Amino acid sequence: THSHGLFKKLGIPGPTPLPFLGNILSYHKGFCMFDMECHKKYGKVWGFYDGQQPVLAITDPDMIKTVLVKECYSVFTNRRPFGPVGFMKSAISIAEDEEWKRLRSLLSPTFTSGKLKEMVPIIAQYGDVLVRNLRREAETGKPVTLKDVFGAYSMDVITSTSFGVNIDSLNNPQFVENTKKLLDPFFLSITVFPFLIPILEVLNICVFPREVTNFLRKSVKRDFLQLMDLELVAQSIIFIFAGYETTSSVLSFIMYELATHPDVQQKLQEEIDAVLPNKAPPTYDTVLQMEYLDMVVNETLRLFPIAMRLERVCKKDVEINGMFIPKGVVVMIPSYALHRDPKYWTEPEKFLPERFSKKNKDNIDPYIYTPFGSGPRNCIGMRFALMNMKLALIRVLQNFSFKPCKETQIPLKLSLGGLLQPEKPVVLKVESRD
Amino acid sequence: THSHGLFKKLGIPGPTPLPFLGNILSYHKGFCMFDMECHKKYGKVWGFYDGQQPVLAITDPDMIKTVLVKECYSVFTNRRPFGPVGFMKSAISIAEDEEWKRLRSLLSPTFTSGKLKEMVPIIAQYGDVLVRNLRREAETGKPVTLKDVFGAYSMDVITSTSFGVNIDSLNNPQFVENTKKLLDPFFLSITVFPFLIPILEVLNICVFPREVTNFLRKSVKRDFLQLMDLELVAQSIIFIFAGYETTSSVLSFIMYELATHPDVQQKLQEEIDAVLPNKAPPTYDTVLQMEYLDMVVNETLRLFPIAMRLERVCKKDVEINGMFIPKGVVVMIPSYALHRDPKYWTEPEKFLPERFSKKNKDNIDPYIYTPFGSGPRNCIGMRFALMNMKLALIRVLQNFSFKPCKETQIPLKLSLGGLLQPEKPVVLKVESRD
Ligand code: HEM
Ligand code: HEM
């Protein structure tokens, strides 16, 4: 409660904080809705408090660019300090200043266009497993829970790309467990009581069950791995989360959009049959040829950017684009709110892949649309992820069409907790094109 | 208990730590004796743990110089992080990296030879008050408790030099209280439980009774003050501690040595009567003329360096003079042990002012003898303090001689707690020279 006057003092509007809690009660509508309501009432810049942590929200593209790009190494180097992290402090997305640079450099080649082309033949093999497992639930006629099949796929791909362990997760429900081993109760407390984090740290009770962590090095025998003692595995733990949840979630969002916009699904499928003809197998070169696929993926990432917020800690008193940022304030770029802002988007709530057509993509600001972040600390896996999703999308759409059920939640609702994911799992009728 | 193998791993000998406690139980003989025993058994370099804080002790002059002087701004910038500090974080002796530099620069002029000469007439006036208050207890014939009279003097000088408030503390026992408002119970706990410091911080219960702290700004009306909102007073809080305790303590040590070495007391007094004749008043120029006075003060500071230890935190993994210092280890220079080391001192336990005679002072290593520290972060008040003590010594010795009582503790013993001070207060017969 020592900072609660900070935004008053700076002239920065925002919701009035409560002692100890700050504004965290406002989150009862979800992170994303809080951000949108705040943008609506307060304007371009506002401040609020996560417990006692002042957070400054910025929506001006120039200032976003200054924060993510220009003044990154100097001022905005790290994300918000989190609670019990333990050895996971060595994670590339957790490391701060030095060590990060090291990890980042030590890993940037592992995500070069070169390795991806080398991995495209590999991950394509789980597309077929996916098609067959799809054709199984399809022939039954019963609705399909996309998260389950896509999850199995995503898990299959990340395990092979990161270790070479080739498994059929959906058909081998038993590495499968260990990874599958995965709301906001203690977390809230850790926010209001950040002073208990060091206690939690010394008890060796990090957030993860750190018993599969032994399993990982116990399974690190001596792909992402061959492209390289305990910190080594800490990076791969981050890769699995990315490769599994975010990928499968985004895949479910896209299929939801495709099933609810048949014309879009048909056009995409026409693009996939023009390219890649006769259910031909997708390659690295072929994917980068499919323009409408890129627009569909991009639109969906506009509607549903699974990171929701971009965040950087101000390391020193600075003044950027005419406003003073005191040391220690977290600067938040509310990507979700920005993706749905009518200032930058006509009918922001409408799915409209044409926004991203070669004509219209120009009039789109790269600091307003930030599905993968920006500047030095952006998503190192963006290319890998897009390819992985596109490859999935192509093979599935080469063989199946997707339709709403009685069971499908329309309009989809977002989950109320702290992850960008559907309220109800996406469930769709799947019909074979043959 | 996560670092307890660190010195094993580095090849660095030391006392075996205990989980959670480290080696703090070894302190039962006092900081200083622990350091001496360790130096005796382990050699030039050893390591130990204050709870979980690894501390590396170095005794090689070259490496000390590298730590205090060469690699200060780069590696060894700050002292050990302490427990609940609160606003007192703004203190020059607590501030770290930046802010320190600022304070240090913002205060270095306040301790220039120039202001001291301006303050010498001022502080000389409390020498006379001291003489008279001395002549009072003297005429009674009863033994004198040097800490009480010297304390009143030290308090009188620091209050006038830092604010201009001229008071007769000994004769006005009622600012007097507020400052006078001044063992190791919770402290030990805070060492073994550093994880509770942030708790203690958020409760606004800093170590000081922070009610006289209001009094200070309530008495900061708008000397050290005129040579210049809340941090301003935080520096003056540090000045009072220095001006009061350390000065009065060192004065008591010196008088103890003088009373126990009559020949030394007589020689000094001959030097004061040769200079400054006929109980003439001491001036800035006169003081710097008295060579034997400088040797007596210096010898006593060898025997009793009230800081006992010098300490710097290693900010980054470095390798100095052929040994690797991991980040976060406190590097400790055990001044007390070094001042009493037979490698550098003949008969180190003997009081021998001649060690510091113009002939012998040359063969004395400035990194072995560090009563005021060294390099950028040394005692900013060294000159002020020496002048203050010397002025006191001169006026007192111009009028009185000092002798042991039945009541005097001979040989003096050092207090067992964490301050360098006598076990029993020094008590001496005081006889008037007239
Ligand atoms: C649809 C899939 C994904 C999306 C939308 C996504 C989005 C993001 C975003 C918005 C950030 C933060 C950027 C910033 O701070 O400016 C990020 C960071 C990161 N992502 Fe992804 N991501 C995805 C998948 C992946 C994948 C597949 C990988 C690796 C295999 C990955 C690895 C990382 C890493 C390591 C970081 C932290 C970068 C750093 O700390 O320097 N992500 N991602
Ligand atoms: C006999 C009297 C004194 C002795 C023996 C003494 C000794 C020391 C020592 C050993 C240090 C640490 C040096 C290092 O870290 O290398 C120190 C620091 C310091 N002393 Fe003194 N001191 C005395 C009196 C004073 C006085 C009278 C003042 C001011 C009026 C003062 C102000 C300071 C300050 C501000 C620091 C911290 C410097 C910094 O953080 O940059 N001291 N002193």
Residue-range domains of chain A with CATH: 5-432 (1.10.630.10)
- Reduce the DSSP state of residue B194 to 3 states and report it: helix
- Taking CA–CA distances from B98, the nearest residue in chain A reads A316
Of the candidates A197, A198, A163, the residue with the CA atom closest to the CA atom of residue A178: A163
Q: Helix, strand or coil for residue B257?
A: helix
Q: Tell me the chain A residues in contact with residue B201 when contact means C-beta distances shorter than 8 Å.
A: 195
Write down the residue that tokens 């479910």 correspond to: A252
CA distance linking residue A363 with residue A361, whole number of Å: 6
The experimental method, as deposited, was X-ray
Q: Starting from the CA of residue A308, give the closest ligand.
A: 1
Half-sphere exposure of A260 (CA within 13 A, CB side): 18
Q: Report the Cα B266 to chain-centroid distance in Å.
A: 27
- Token pair for B426: 């020094």
Q: Which residue has the tokens 């005129």?
A: B226
Asked if B325 contacts B9 with a C-beta cutoff of 8 angstroms, the reply is no
Instruction: Tally A–B CB contacts below 8 A.
Output: 11
- Ligand 2 pocket member B242 (CB < 6 A): yes
- Cα–Cα dist A139/B82, whole Å: 69
Q: Is B310 helix (H, G, I), strand (E, B) or coil?
A: strand
The distance of Cα A235 from the centroid of its chain, to the nearest Å, equals 16
What three-state secondary structure class fits A150?
helix
Find how far residue B365's CA is from the centre of its chain: 20
**What CA–CA distance (Å, rounded) separates A218 from A211?**
10
Helix B262-274 × helix B247-260 angle, to 10°: 110
d(CA B361, CA B363): 6
**Share in percent of chain A as helix, strand, coil (round to 5):** 50, 10, 40
Give resolution, Å, one decimal: 2.3
Among B202, B315, B316, which would you mutate to test the A interface (most chain A Cβ atoms within 10 Å of its Cβ)? B202
Q: Is B64 in the pocket of ligand 2 (CB under 6 A)?
A: no
Residue A372 beta carbon below 6 angstroms from any ligand 1 atom:
yes
Phi, psi at B427, each rounded to 5°: -130, 125
* Ligand 1 close to Cβ of residue A27 (< 6 A): no
Breaks, C-N > 2.5 A, in chain B lie after 174, 182, 222, 228
Instruction: Tell me if chain B has a CB within 8 Å of the CB of A199.
Output: yes
The span from the first CA to the last CA of chain B, in angstroms, equals 64
Ligand nearest to the CA of B370: 2
The whole-angstrom separation of Cα A278 and Cα A290 is 16
Ligand 1 contact via A6 beta carbon (within 6 Å)? no
Dist CA B59 CA A244 (whole Å): 55
* Atom 26 (ligand 1) nearest CA: A381
- Residues flagged as binding site of A: 379
**Distance between CA B388 and CA B146 in Å, rounded?**
16
The answer to whether B331 and B314 are in contact (CB under 8 A) is yes
Is B311 strand, coil or helix?
Answer: strand
- The whole-angstrom separation of Cα A86 and Cα A121 is 37
d(CA A334, CA A338): 6
Q: Is B102 on the interface with A (CB under 8 A)?
A: no
Which residue from A minimizes the CA distance to B196?
A199
Using a 10 angstrom Cβ sphere, with 0-12 exposed, 13-18 middle and 19 or more buried, the burial of residue B149 is buried
Count of beta carbons in the 10 Å neighbourhood of residue A103: 21
Q: Which of A252, A264, A261 is nearest to A304 (CA)?
A: A252
Nearest CA to B426 out of B415, B416, B418, B412 is that of B412
Exposure string (b/e) for B109-120, b if CB count within 10 Å is 16 or more?
ebbeeebbeebb
Look-up of token digits 């992985």: A388
Residue B176 half-sphere exposure toward CB, CA atoms < 13 A: 11
Q: How many angstroms separate the CA atoms of A64 and A375, rounded?
A: 10
CA distance B318 to chain A (A): 14
Residue B198, min C-alpha distance to chain A (Å): 6
Ligand nearest to the CA of residue B369, numbered in listed order: 2
CA of A382 to the centre of ligand 1 (A): 6
Q: Which amino acid is it at A364?
A: I
**Residue identifier of the C-alpha nearest atom 33 of ligand 2:** B379
Give the separation between CA A124 and CA B202, rounded to whole angstroms.
55
Rounded CA gap, A268 and A265, in Å? 5
B324 - beta bridge partners? B319
State the Cα–Cα distance between residues A328 and A201, nearest whole angstrom: 22
Residue A21: φ, ψ to 5°: -75, -30
User: Which residue's CA is the closest to the ligand 1 atom numbered 17?
Assistant: A379
A86: closest chain B residue by CA: B2
Chain A residue with Cα closest to B197: A195
- Give the distance (Å) from ligand 2 centre to CA of residue B176: 23
Q: Does ligand 1 come within 6 angstroms of the Cβ of A287?
A: no
Comparing alpha-carbon positions, the chain A residue that sits nearest to B198 is A195
| Distance between CA atoms of residues B143 and B403, nearest Å | 10
Which residue is closest in CA terms to ligand 2's atom 18?
B379
A133, A170 in Cβ contact below 8 A?
yes
As given in the structure block, the two tokens for residue B333 are 């220079």
Burial A52-72 (b: 16+ CB within 10 A, else e): bbbbbbbbebebbbbbbbbbb
Q: Is the CB of B321 under 6 A from ligand 2?
A: no
Residue in A202, A229, A230 to test binding to B, most B beta-carbons within 10 Å: A202
Nearest alpha carbon, ligand 2 atom 7: B372
Distance from CA of A108 to the nearest CA of B (A): 24
Q: How many CB atoms lie within 10 A of CB B46?
A: 22
Q: In terms of Cα–Cα distance, which of A334, A367, A339 is closest to A351?
A: A339
What is the rounded CA–CA span in Å between residue A40 and residue B198? 37
Strand partners, A45: A58
A324 and B CB contact within 8 Å: no
**Residue where the block lists tokens 């001959």:** B270
- Please give the number of the atom of ligand 1 that sits closest to the Cα of A384: 27
Give the count of alpha carbons within 13 A of B87, CB side only. Answer: 18
Residue nearest to atom 17 of ligand 2 (CA): B379
Calpha distance A299→A309 (Å, rounded): 17
| Cβ contacts of A16-20, under 8 Å, gap ≥ 24 | A17/A48, A17/A49, A20/A51, A20/A52, A20/A192
Residue A154 contacts residue A247 (beta carbons within 8 Å): yes
Cβ atoms < 10 Å from Cβ of B371: 23
